[PDB]
């Protein structure tokens, strides 16, 4: 089901089992380092293993999350094999501890052995605007799509703006459950006959 | 406008496009702290470090990585993990380690974490190509078009990025910028930079490597310029008279 697709939920207890495998999984999360924080232990906790079987992840990092978010890389069953840098710019492309900060950090890991994807087609570099705080860029998802393009991908902690066709979005400010895809709708019923997550 | 779509039509990198890509008594009160450039020739695989002294307050870390010859001996990160950086390392110090874009990016992560150090930046030198509008590490997912500068501490004005026309092919020289953000962060005055070479020589450093073709090196004169009353200054005041 192509059309954008979301789950409020708090991605700590939803089994994600029901979603199936995607292609592509991204991201962001709220790292412990304003908003609904998650401990580290907790985030070693994800279930991301079971979201591919092959393909890649997307998964922003800032501050000491840099090496937390590549220990969770790590631990999940990637190897990182890329790093995306967002260069901020306002809208007249000038750059926006120790120094100040003009980018943004998204580490690339890969699962398995994937086939069939353009590798090459973009390049390690993202220049954009920015838009409202912690908004990632708009161009991941055009270099998502041309990396691998029409796959099913998933997008954990996301927000409503974060909402795309081919994705499915997890967070816990997004407005209800929309779900199309038939495959998925069966085993969320079957899973949560009630429509509620709790443990 | 999209910059990534806009590189998959064209084949400029989004950086091209980043445009403008005073301090000025700092600076010049660095020059005048710095000391004479100092430098020695030495197999760094085959020399032992312990023999640089005293123990430096910032370390520039730039080995030759086999990436580094993409169209052209290496150093593996084995070899450089190897290396016993923190014998020759202040209490209090900084280390400066060019990591490239693959592998590096983690195991120079763990050189950091076995020397010591804890990272707190990521410097990003961002390669445009305005001028040639890339074959790919197998293991790449993108066009790689940067490398970064770690910088680590232990112990108690400027962006972390820097922007510059790729190099032409087999020139691995680093943009000379990495030493003005060093500077501009007044650590101190004993500094090394470990694999330069005869045109990394600067004031203000002590440089060692297997391709410089002269030496001037002596422990004891080096240590001289550190003797009171200048053993604490950050490099970045006026000379004690
Ligand atoms: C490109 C960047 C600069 C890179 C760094 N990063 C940092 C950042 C900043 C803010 C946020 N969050 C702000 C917010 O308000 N909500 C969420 C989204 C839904 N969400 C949850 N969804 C399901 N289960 C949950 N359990 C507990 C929370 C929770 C809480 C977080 C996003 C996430 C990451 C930003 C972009």
């Known amino acids: ?199 | 406008n999209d910059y990534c779509q806009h590189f998959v039509d064209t084949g400029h990198r989004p950086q091209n496009f980043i445009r403008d890509v005073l301090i000025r008594l700092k600076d010049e009160l660095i020059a005048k702290s710095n000391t004479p450039p100092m430098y020695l020739q030495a197999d760094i695989e085959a020399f032992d470090i312990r023999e640089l002294t005293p123990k430096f307050d910032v370390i520039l870390l730039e080995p030759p990585l086999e990436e580094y010859y993409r169209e052209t001996k290496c150093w593996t990160w084995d070899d450089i993990m190897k290396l016993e950086i923190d014998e020759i390392a202040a209490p209090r110090s900084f280390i400066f380690l060019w990591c490239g874009s693959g592998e590096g990016l983690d195991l120079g992560r763990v050189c950091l974490r076995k020397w010591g150090y804890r990272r707190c930046e990521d410097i990003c030198w961002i390669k445009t190509n305005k001028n040639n509008p890339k074959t790919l590490d197998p293991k790449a997912v993108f066009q790689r078009t940067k490398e970064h500068c770690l910088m680590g501490i232990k112990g108690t004005v400027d962006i972390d990025l820097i922007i510059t026309e790729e190099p032409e092919i087999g020139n691995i020289e680093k943009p000379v910028e990495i030493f003005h953000i060093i500077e501009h962060f007044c650590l101190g005055r004993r500094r090394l930079h470990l694999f330069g070479r005869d045109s990394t020589i600067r004031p203000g450093w002590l440089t060692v490597g297997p391709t410089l073709t002269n030496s001037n090196y002596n422990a004891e004169t080096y240590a001289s310029y550190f003797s009171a009353p200048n053993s604490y200054l950050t490099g970045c005041t006026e000379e004690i008279e």
């Not at chain 1, 412990?32 to 906790?45: A, C, H, K, N, S």
């Not at chain 1, 094999?81 to 943004?104: P, Y």
Request: charged share 25%.
């Open chain 1, 1 to 199: 089901l192509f059309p954008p697709q979301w789950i409020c939920c708090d991605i700590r207890y939803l089994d994600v089992s029901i979603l199936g495998k995607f292609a592509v999984v991204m991201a962001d999360p709220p790292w412990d380092i304003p908003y609904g924080t998650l401990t580290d232990d907790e985030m070693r906790r994800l279930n991301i293993p079971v979201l591919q079987d092959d393909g890649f992840l997307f998964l922003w990092v800032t501050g000491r999350a840099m090496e937390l978010g590549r220990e969770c890389l790590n631990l999940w069953g990637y190897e990182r094999v890329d790093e995306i840098i967002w260069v901020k710019t306002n809208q007249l492309q000038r750059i926006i501890h120790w120094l100040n900060h003009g980018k943004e950090h998204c580490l690339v890991g890969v699962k398995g052995n994937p086939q069939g994807f353009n590798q090459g087609l973009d390049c390690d570099v993202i220049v954009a605007e920015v838009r409202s705080t912690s908004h990632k860029p708009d161009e991941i998802y055009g270099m998502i799509e041309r990396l691998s393009p029409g796959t099913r991908k998933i997008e954990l902690f996301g927000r409503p703006h974060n909402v795309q066709p081919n994705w499915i979005t997890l967070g816990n400010q997004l407005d209800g459950i929309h779900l199309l895809d038939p495959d998925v709708v069966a085993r969320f019923k079957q899973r949560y006959p009630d429509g509620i997550i709790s443990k």
